[PDB]
Paper text:
As a model β-strand mediated PPI, we use the GKAP/SHANK-PDZ50 which, plays a role in the organization of synaptic protein complexes and has been linked to several neuronal disorders. There are >250 PDZ domains with several therapeutically relevant proteins known to exhibit their function through a PDZ mediated interaction. Class I PDZ domains bind to consensus sequences with a Thr/Ser in the -2 position from the C-terminus, with the C-terminus hydrophobic residue and free carboxylate being the main determinants of affinity.
Interestingly, the most potent hybrids formed from 3 and 4 contained the same carboxylic acid functionalized aromatic aldehyde fragments (A047 and A048), indicating that these types of fragments might play an important role in binding. In all hybrids, the hydrazone bond existed in an E configuration with the aromatic ring of the fragment co-planar with the hydrazone. This indicated that the more flexible linker allows for a better orientation of the fragment leading to a more favourable enthalpy of binding, but also increases the entropic cost of binding, leading only to a moderate difference in the overall binding energy. We compared the ability to bind to SHANK1 PDZ against the ability to bind to the PDZ domain of PSD-95, a therapeutically important target in neuronal diseases and cancer. We monitored the binding using chemical shift perturbations in the 1H–15N HSQC spectra of the PDZ domain of PSD-95.
Numbering used by the authors: 651 to 681, 689 to 758
Amino acid sequence: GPLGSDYIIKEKTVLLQKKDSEGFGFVLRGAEFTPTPAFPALQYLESVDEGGVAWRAGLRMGDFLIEVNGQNVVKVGHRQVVNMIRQGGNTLMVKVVMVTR
Ligand SMILES: CC(C)C[C@H](N)C(=O)O
């Protein structure tokens, strides 16, 4: 609008269940930190393997990572988030948000 940017925010929570001999099929990248509607989290999905576990569940390149296995990771550093994802083994529940600007 004339007073500022408008967005659509689409929240997606998915359960990823993978096999031992595969990844979840995404690459995390990291963008004090205060979240904003346009910029909701430090970590986001730089890429998602088409047809991989994450892709099939509905995750997409550009999604911002909000939660991992019930823990909010909006303000959490890259290495820490990766370690939290690995703690779950072959199971990962994540919440992401897709921002259209
Ligand atoms: C967050 C990362 C550890 C995910 C990893 N690249 C995978 O595809 O399983």
